[PDB]
Coordinates of C-alpha atoms and ligand atoms in Angstrom, one line a residue:
Chain C
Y16 CA 0.0 0.0 0.0
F17 CA 2.7 2.5 1.1
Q18 CA 6.0 2.0 -0.9
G19 CA 9.0 1.6 1.3
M20 CA 10.8 -1.3 2.8
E21 CA 8.3 -3.4 4.7
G22 CA 9.1 -4.1 8.4
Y23 CA 9.4 -7.8 8.0
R24 CA 12.6 -7.4 6.0
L25 CA 14.3 -6.4 9.3
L26 CA 14.4 -10.2 10.3
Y27 CA 16.2 -11.1 7.1
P28 CA 18.0 -12.9 5.7
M29 CA 15.9 -15.9 6.8
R30 CA 16.2 -19.6 6.1
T31 CA 14.1 -20.8 3.2
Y32 CA 12.4 -24.2 3.5
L33 CA 9.9 -26.2 1.4
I34 CA 6.5 -27.3 2.7
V35 CA 5.1 -30.5 1.3
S36 CA 1.3 -31.1 1.7
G37 CA -1.4 -33.6 0.5
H38 CA -0.7 -37.0 -0.9
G39 CA -0.8 -38.9 -4.1
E40 CA -2.5 -36.9 -6.9
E41 CA -2.9 -33.9 -4.5
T42 CA 0.7 -33.7 -3.5
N43 CA 1.9 -30.1 -3.2
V44 CA 5.1 -28.1 -2.4
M45 CA 5.6 -24.5 -1.6
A46 CA 8.5 -22.4 -0.5
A47 CA 8.3 -20.9 3.1
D48 CA 10.6 -18.6 5.0
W49 CA 8.4 -18.2 8.1
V50 CA 9.2 -21.4 9.9
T51 CA 10.5 -21.9 13.4
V52 CA 10.9 -24.5 16.1
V53 CA 8.6 -23.9 19.1
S54 CA 9.4 -26.8 21.5
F55 CA 12.4 -29.1 22.2
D56 CA 10.7 -31.9 24.0
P57 CA 8.2 -32.8 22.4
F58 CA 9.7 -31.6 19.1
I59 CA 7.2 -29.1 17.7
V60 CA 7.5 -26.7 14.7
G61 CA 5.4 -23.9 13.2
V62 CA 4.9 -22.4 9.7
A63 CA 3.0 -19.2 8.8
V64 CA 0.8 -19.9 5.7
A65 CA -1.5 -17.4 4.0
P66 CA -5.1 -18.7 3.5
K67 CA -4.6 -18.0 -0.2
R68 CA -2.0 -20.8 -0.7
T69 CA -3.1 -24.1 -2.1
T70 CA -0.8 -25.4 0.7
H71 CA -3.2 -23.9 3.2
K72 CA -6.1 -25.9 1.7
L73 CA -4.1 -29.2 1.7
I74 CA -2.9 -28.7 5.3
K75 CA -6.4 -28.0 6.6
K76 CA -7.7 -31.0 4.7
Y77 CA -5.3 -33.6 5.8
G78 CA -3.8 -32.3 9.1
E79 CA -0.2 -33.1 8.1
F80 CA 2.8 -31.5 6.4
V81 CA 6.4 -32.0 5.7
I82 CA 9.2 -29.4 6.0
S83 CA 11.8 -30.3 3.6
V84 CA 15.2 -28.7 3.8
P85 CA 16.5 -27.5 0.4
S86 CA 20.2 -26.7 -0.6
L87 CA 21.2 -23.8 -2.8
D88 CA 21.7 -26.3 -5.6
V89 CA 17.9 -26.7 -6.0
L90 CA 17.1 -23.0 -6.0
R91 CA 15.4 -23.5 -9.3
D92 CA 12.9 -26.0 -7.9
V93 CA 12.6 -23.8 -4.7
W94 CA 11.7 -20.8 -7.0
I95 CA 9.1 -22.8 -8.8
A96 CA 7.6 -23.9 -5.4
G97 CA 7.5 -20.3 -4.4
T98 CA 6.1 -18.9 -7.7
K99 CA 3.6 -21.3 -9.2
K100 CA 0.4 -22.8 -7.7
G101 CA -0.8 -26.2 -6.6
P102 CA 0.1 -29.7 -7.6
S103 CA 0.7 -29.1 -11.4
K104 CA 4.0 -27.3 -10.6
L105 CA 5.6 -30.7 -9.8
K106 CA 5.9 -31.3 -13.5
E107 CA 8.3 -28.5 -13.6
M108 CA 10.2 -29.7 -10.5
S109 CA 13.4 -31.7 -10.3
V110 CA 12.2 -33.5 -7.2
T111 CA 11.4 -37.1 -6.2
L112 CA 8.6 -37.8 -3.7
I113 CA 9.3 -40.8 -1.5
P114 CA 7.0 -42.1 1.2
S115 CA 7.4 -40.6 4.7
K116 CA 7.5 -42.8 7.9
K117 CA 4.5 -41.4 9.9
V118 CA 2.6 -38.9 7.8
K119 CA 0.8 -39.6 4.5
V120 CA 2.4 -36.5 3.0
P121 CA 5.5 -37.6 1.0
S122 CA 9.1 -36.5 1.5
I123 CA 11.6 -35.0 -1.0
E124 CA 14.6 -37.3 -1.6
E125 CA 16.9 -34.6 -2.7
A126 CA 16.0 -32.7 0.5
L127 CA 18.9 -32.3 3.1
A128 CA 16.2 -33.2 5.6
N129 CA 12.4 -33.8 5.7
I130 CA 10.5 -33.1 8.9
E131 CA 7.2 -35.0 9.2
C132 CA 4.5 -33.1 11.1
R133 CA 1.0 -33.7 12.5
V134 CA -0.9 -30.5 12.9
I135 CA -1.9 -29.7 16.6
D136 CA -3.0 -26.1 16.3
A137 CA -3.9 -23.4 13.8
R138 CA -4.1 -19.9 14.8
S139 CA -4.8 -16.9 12.8
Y140 CA -2.5 -13.8 13.1
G141 CA -3.0 -11.0 10.6
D142 CA -2.9 -12.3 6.9
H143 CA -1.5 -15.8 7.7
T144 CA -2.4 -19.0 9.6
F145 CA 0.3 -20.2 12.0
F146 CA 0.2 -24.0 11.6
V147 CA 1.8 -25.7 14.6
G148 CA 2.9 -29.3 14.0
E149 CA 4.2 -32.0 16.3
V150 CA 7.3 -33.7 14.7
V151 CA 6.3 -37.4 14.6
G152 CA 9.1 -38.6 12.3
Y153 CA 12.2 -37.3 10.4
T154 CA 14.8 -38.2 7.8
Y155 CA 18.0 -36.5 6.6
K156 CA 21.1 -36.8 4.6
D157 CA 24.0 -38.0 6.9
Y158 CA 26.7 -35.7 5.3
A159 CA 24.5 -32.6 5.6
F160 CA 24.5 -33.3 9.4
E161 CA 27.6 -35.5 9.8
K162 CA 28.9 -34.4 13.2
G163 CA 25.4 -34.3 14.7
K164 CA 25.5 -30.7 13.6
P165 CA 24.8 -29.1 10.2
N166 CA 27.6 -29.6 7.7
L167 CA 28.0 -26.0 6.1
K168 CA 29.5 -27.5 2.8
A169 CA 25.9 -28.8 2.3
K170 CA 24.8 -25.2 1.1
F171 CA 21.9 -24.5 3.4
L172 CA 19.5 -22.0 1.8
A173 CA 18.7 -18.4 2.9
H174 CA 16.6 -15.5 1.5
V175 CA 17.8 -12.0 1.4
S176 CA 15.4 -10.1 -0.9
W177 CA 12.5 -11.1 -3.2
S178 CA 14.5 -12.9 -5.9
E179 CA 18.0 -13.1 -4.2
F180 CA 19.4 -16.0 -2.1
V181 CA 22.7 -16.9 -0.3
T182 CA 24.3 -19.7 1.8
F183 CA 26.5 -19.5 4.9
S184 CA 30.2 -18.8 5.3
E185 CA 32.2 -21.8 6.0
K186 CA 34.1 -19.7 8.5
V187 CA 32.9 -20.7 12.0
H188 CA 33.3 -18.4 15.1
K189 CA 33.5 -20.1 18.5
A190 CA 31.7 -18.2 21.4
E191 CA 33.8 -20.2 23.9
Chain V
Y16 CA 17.5 -38.1 27.8
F17 CA 18.6 -40.1 24.8
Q18 CA 22.0 -39.0 23.5
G19 CA 21.9 -38.4 19.8
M20 CA 21.4 -35.3 17.7
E21 CA 18.1 -33.8 18.6
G22 CA 15.6 -33.3 15.9
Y23 CA 15.4 -29.5 16.1
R24 CA 19.0 -29.4 14.7
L25 CA 17.5 -30.2 11.3
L26 CA 16.2 -26.6 10.9
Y27 CA 19.7 -25.2 11.5
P28 CA 21.6 -23.0 11.0
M29 CA 19.1 -20.5 12.2
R30 CA 19.3 -16.8 12.7
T31 CA 20.2 -15.7 16.2
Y32 CA 18.4 -12.6 17.7
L33 CA 18.3 -10.8 21.0
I34 CA 15.2 -10.4 23.0
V35 CA 14.9 -7.3 25.2
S36 CA 12.3 -7.3 28.1
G37 CA 11.3 -5.2 31.1
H38 CA 12.3 -1.5 31.6
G39 CA 14.7 0.5 33.8
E40 CA 16.0 -1.5 36.6
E41 CA 14.4 -4.7 35.4
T42 CA 15.8 -4.5 31.9
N43 CA 16.7 -7.9 30.5
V44 CA 18.2 -9.3 27.3
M45 CA 18.4 -13.0 26.2
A46 CA 19.5 -14.7 23.0
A47 CA 16.9 -16.4 20.9
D48 CA 17.0 -18.5 17.8
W49 CA 13.3 -19.4 17.6
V50 CA 11.9 -16.3 16.2
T51 CA 9.7 -15.9 13.0
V52 CA 7.4 -13.4 11.2
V53 CA 3.8 -14.6 11.4
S54 CA 2.0 -11.8 9.4
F55 CA 2.8 -9.2 6.8
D56 CA -0.1 -6.8 7.2
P57 CA -0.4 -6.1 10.3
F58 CA 3.3 -6.8 11.0
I59 CA 3.3 -9.5 13.7
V60 CA 6.3 -11.7 15.0
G61 CA 6.6 -14.6 17.4
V62 CA 9.3 -16.0 19.7
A63 CA 9.4 -19.3 21.6
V64 CA 10.5 -18.7 25.2
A65 CA 10.8 -21.3 27.9
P66 CA 9.0 -20.6 31.1
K67 CA 12.3 -20.9 33.0
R68 CA 13.8 -17.8 31.3
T69 CA 13.8 -14.5 33.3
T70 CA 12.8 -13.1 29.9
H71 CA 9.5 -15.2 30.2
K72 CA 8.7 -13.5 33.6
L73 CA 9.4 -10.0 32.2
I74 CA 7.4 -10.6 29.0
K75 CA 4.3 -11.8 31.0
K76 CA 4.6 -9.0 33.5
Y77 CA 4.7 -6.1 31.1
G78 CA 3.3 -7.4 27.8
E79 CA 6.0 -6.0 25.6
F80 CA 9.3 -7.0 24.0
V81 CA 12.0 -6.0 21.7
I82 CA 13.7 -8.2 19.1
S83 CA 17.1 -6.6 18.5
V84 CA 19.2 -7.7 15.6
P85 CA 22.8 -8.4 16.4
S86 CA 25.9 -8.6 14.2
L87 CA 28.7 -11.2 14.3
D88 CA 30.8 -8.5 15.8
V89 CA 28.8 -8.6 19.1
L90 CA 28.9 -12.3 19.5
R91 CA 30.4 -11.8 23.0
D92 CA 27.5 -9.9 24.2
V93 CA 25.1 -12.3 22.4
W94 CA 26.8 -15.3 24.2
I95 CA 26.4 -13.6 27.6
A96 CA 22.7 -12.9 26.8
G97 CA 22.4 -16.6 26.0
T98 CA 24.3 -17.9 28.9
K99 CA 23.8 -15.8 32.0
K100 CA 20.5 -14.9 33.7
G101 CA 18.4 -11.9 34.4
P102 CA 19.2 -8.2 34.5
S103 CA 22.7 -8.4 36.3
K104 CA 24.2 -9.7 33.0
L105 CA 24.0 -6.2 31.5
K106 CA 27.0 -5.2 33.5
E107 CA 29.0 -7.6 31.5
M108 CA 27.5 -6.4 28.3
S109 CA 28.9 -4.0 25.7
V110 CA 25.4 -2.7 24.9
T111 CA 23.7 0.7 25.2
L112 CA 19.9 0.8 26.0
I113 CA 18.1 3.7 24.3
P114 CA 14.4 4.4 24.6
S115 CA 12.0 2.8 22.2
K116 CA 9.3 4.6 20.3
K117 CA 6.1 2.7 21.4
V118 CA 7.1 0.2 23.9
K119 CA 8.6 0.8 27.4
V120 CA 11.1 -1.9 26.9
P121 CA 14.4 -0.3 25.7
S122 CA 16.2 -0.8 22.4
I123 CA 19.9 -1.8 21.9
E124 CA 21.7 1.0 19.9
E125 CA 24.4 -1.2 18.5
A126 CA 21.7 -3.5 17.1
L127 CA 21.3 -3.6 13.4
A128 CA 17.5 -3.3 14.1
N129 CA 15.2 -3.2 17.0
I130 CA 11.7 -4.5 16.5
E131 CA 9.2 -3.1 19.2
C132 CA 6.4 -5.6 20.0
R133 CA 3.1 -5.6 22.0
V134 CA 2.1 -9.1 23.1
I135 CA -1.2 -10.2 21.6
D136 CA -1.0 -13.9 22.3
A137 CA 0.8 -16.5 24.4
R138 CA 0.4 -20.1 23.6
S139 CA 2.0 -23.1 25.2
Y140 CA 3.5 -25.8 22.9
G141 CA 5.7 -28.4 24.7
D142 CA 8.4 -26.9 26.9
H143 CA 8.2 -23.2 25.5
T144 CA 5.7 -20.4 25.4
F145 CA 5.1 -18.9 21.9
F146 CA 4.8 -15.2 22.5
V147 CA 3.1 -13.5 19.5
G148 CA 3.7 -9.7 19.3
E149 CA 2.3 -7.0 17.1
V150 CA 5.1 -4.8 15.7
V151 CA 4.1 -1.3 16.8
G152 CA 7.4 0.4 16.1
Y153 CA 10.9 -0.2 14.6
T154 CA 14.3 1.3 14.2
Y155 CA 17.4 0.1 12.3
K156 CA 20.8 1.1 11.0
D157 CA 20.5 2.5 7.4
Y158 CA 23.7 0.8 6.1
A159 CA 22.6 -2.6 7.4
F160 CA 19.4 -2.3 5.2
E161 CA 20.6 0.4 2.6
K162 CA 18.9 -0.8 -0.6
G163 CA 15.7 -1.5 1.3
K164 CA 17.1 -5.0 1.6
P165 CA 19.7 -6.4 4.0
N166 CA 23.2 -5.4 3.4
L167 CA 25.3 -8.7 3.8
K168 CA 28.4 -6.8 4.7
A169 CA 26.6 -6.0 8.0
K170 CA 27.5 -9.5 9.3
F171 CA 24.0 -10.8 10.2
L172 CA 24.3 -13.6 12.8
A173 CA 23.4 -17.3 12.6
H174 CA 23.8 -20.4 14.9
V175 CA 25.1 -23.7 13.7
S176 CA 25.8 -25.7 16.9
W177 CA 25.8 -25.0 20.6
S178 CA 28.8 -22.7 20.7
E179 CA 29.4 -22.1 17.0
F180 CA 28.2 -19.2 14.8
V181 CA 28.6 -18.0 11.2
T182 CA 27.4 -15.1 8.8
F183 CA 26.3 -15.3 5.3
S184 CA 28.2 -15.4 2.0
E185 CA 28.4 -12.2 0.2
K186 CA 27.8 -14.1 -3.0
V187 CA 24.2 -13.7 -4.1
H188 CA 22.4 -16.1 -6.4
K189 CA 19.5 -14.7 -8.5
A190 CA 16.4 -16.9 -9.0
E191 CA 15.4 -14.9 -12.0
Ligands
FMN1 C1 11.5 -17.8 -0.8 C2 10.0 -17.9 -0.6 C3 9.5 -18.0 0.7 C4 8.2 -18.0 0.9 N1 7.6 -18.1 2.1 C5 6.3 -18.2 2.4 C6 5.7 -18.4 3.7 O1 6.5 -18.4 4.7 N2 4.4 -18.4 3.9 C7 3.6 -18.3 2.8 O2 2.3 -18.4 3.0 N3 4.0 -18.2 1.5 C8 5.3 -18.1 1.3 N4 5.8 -18.0 0.0 C9 4.8 -17.9 -1.1 C10 4.5 -19.3 -1.6 O3 5.7 -20.2 -1.6 C11 4.0 -19.0 -3.0 O4 3.0 -18.1 -3.0 C12 3.5 -20.3 -3.7 O5 3.1 -19.9 -5.0 C13 2.1 -20.8 -3.1 O6 2.0 -22.0 -3.7 P1 0.7 -23.0 -3.5 O7 -0.5 -22.1 -3.8 O8 0.9 -24.2 -4.4 O9 0.8 -23.4 -2.0 C14 7.2 -17.9 -0.3 C15 7.7 -17.7 -1.5 C16 9.1 -17.7 -1.8 C17 9.7 -17.6 -3.1
FMN2 C1 22.3 -18.7 20.4 C2 21.2 -18.9 21.5 C3 19.9 -19.0 21.1 C4 18.9 -19.1 22.1 N1 17.6 -19.2 21.8 C5 16.6 -19.3 22.8 C6 15.2 -19.3 22.4 O1 14.9 -19.3 21.2 N2 14.3 -19.6 23.4 C7 14.7 -19.7 24.6 O2 13.8 -19.8 25.6 N3 15.9 -19.7 25.1 C8 16.9 -19.5 24.2 N4 18.2 -19.5 24.6 C9 18.5 -19.6 26.0 C10 18.6 -18.2 26.6 O3 19.1 -17.2 25.7 C11 19.4 -18.4 27.9 O4 19.0 -19.6 28.5 C12 19.4 -17.2 28.8 O5 20.4 -17.5 29.8 C13 18.1 -17.0 29.5 O6 18.3 -15.7 30.1 P1 17.2 -15.0 31.0 O7 17.0 -16.0 32.1 O8 17.9 -13.7 31.5 O9 16.1 -14.6 30.2 C14 19.3 -19.3 23.6 C15 20.6 -19.2 23.9 C16 21.6 -19.1 22.9 C17 23.1 -19.0 23.3
HBA3 O1 9.1 -14.0 1.1 C1 8.7 -14.7 2.0 C2 7.2 -14.8 2.1 C3 6.7 -15.0 3.3 C4 5.3 -15.1 3.4 C5 4.5 -14.9 2.3 O2 3.2 -15.0 2.4 C6 5.1 -14.7 1.0 C7 6.5 -14.6 1.0
HBA4 O1 19.9 -22.9 21.0 C1 18.8 -22.4 20.8 C2 17.9 -22.5 22.0 C3 16.5 -22.4 21.6 C4 15.7 -22.6 22.7 C5 16.1 -22.8 24.0 O2 15.2 -23.0 25.0 C6 17.5 -22.9 24.2 C7 18.4 -22.8 23.2

């Protein structure tokens, strides 16, 4: 409405993830920045999803979602997920759906990690629904997390501005 | 309880922010990874805070908080915020509290950005409270956001493993 840099930009750069929803013929994927962990034990996550997203419809329908973690190498698939709508986009995507362990929603095999979630809350704040999901299963690529921490060579993906992305430095600073 | 890499590590690396709470004598700061935007218009944020944090007490008391954005250069102050407890830590911190525009909670002048929040919800999920706040005012450093986007030279801070941190590459990938 009022040109200027919107206030949400102050939290950026933010990690970019993929959200998978539905199953079989209805299987969808969208990009999502607005994701965070909300509890350590039980493991619970949340994602802000606008009502207008096909992903919002599929999450409400089935009560499950998958957070797949993409690398910088699949930015093209990530961009499609973030720009096109609903399950027909998968026919432009370089992605392989594999079953998941506890949700019906599929996982993305190229993903660094897939986090399988059962929805336990849905609150409305402003123009998005915050979908809170209990992590009931997870898979990942061993090298991307080899020392029980994230391996920075794996090219974890972040978002700076609308069409611009970056990964992390490989230079680590120790706090103690 | 069961040694192994905990499931929350799969979302990492995550941005690290500071949370400011209370005012005057009660002014506190803690580190917080688990922060995300939940709405664009109105601008609304959320932060997962364990009940055991002094910050949890101060947020419930006053209903306000500030998300300050730290750079890699102040990792030492950030580590103190994330390791010590309650307002006495400020006497080890290289930080200058300045007033805020709409909350009573102060801002951190060295911060790349301070995001002034009025609490509008508090839900409990697992071992944390998710504090949802309406952004009612904000300030930032112009060079850190010079092109209306984040300036990567500013050294935005991220968290890889318990005591390890990194910033972003300055190398930008265009998605279109
Ligand atoms: C990097 C990036 C991050 C995004 N993050 C979110 C998000 O956090 N929440 C949201 O509702 N939409 C987000 N979007 C928008 C959706 O990904 C995009 O609108 C998508 O076309 C919706 O697809 P769908 O209708 O198939 O679900 C994002 C887009 C991009 C490119
Ligand atoms: C990098 C980092 C991130 C942190 N993130 C969070 C968080 O998201 N939520 C939380 O409750 N505690 C978090 N903590 C823990 C608090 O910052 C830490 O326990 C602090 O000592 C609590 O201080 P207080 O008791 O003065 O509030 C984090 C600590 C570090 C070092
Ligand atoms: O760019 C990130 C983004 C977040 C939420 C949206 O609704 C759309 C885009
Ligand atoms: O390391 C990040 C962190 C998040 C939540 C906590 O409660 C403690 C630490």
